Write a protein that binds this ligand. Structure first.
Ligand SMILES: [Cl-]
Length: 116
């Protein structure tokens, strides 16, 4: 049973991902200011966060219904689903880090935030 992540849930997941991926201090300061370089360090960090939020599976990819519940923030569920589906694609370059990051960049482009 999926449940929406709070701001506190997300802060914890980011902390856990920084620790478990041994993310260097300079990347943590970039992420804090919503700067996400297009390197494997950043891409695997985003995958880790999305994994913990149950928004992404390394084999199945983006978890569409879970994403709609998380990202809607009081918007129309059908409108948000249409937006999410436009950002959902196949694992064409066989890389779950690249895959999760691509979706994230698409969500950002379309002003879909994890927290309002
Ligand atoms: Cl994030």
């Amino acid at each position: 049973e999926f449940t929406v992540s709070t701001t506190e849930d997300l802060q914890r997941y980011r902390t856990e991902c920084v620790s478990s991926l041994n993310i260097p201090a300079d990347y943590v300061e970039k992420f804090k200011k919503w700067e996400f370089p297009e390197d494997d360090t950043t891409m695997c960090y985003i995958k880790c966060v999305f994994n913990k939020m149950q928004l992404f599976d390394d084999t199945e990819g983006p978890l569409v219904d879970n994403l709609v519940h998380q990202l809607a923030h009081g918007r129309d569920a059908e409108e948000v689903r249409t937006e999410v589906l436009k950002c959902v694609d196949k694992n064409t370059d066989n890389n779950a880090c690249h895959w999760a990051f691509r979706g994230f960049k698409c969500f950002q482009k379309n002003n879909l935030s994890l927290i309002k």
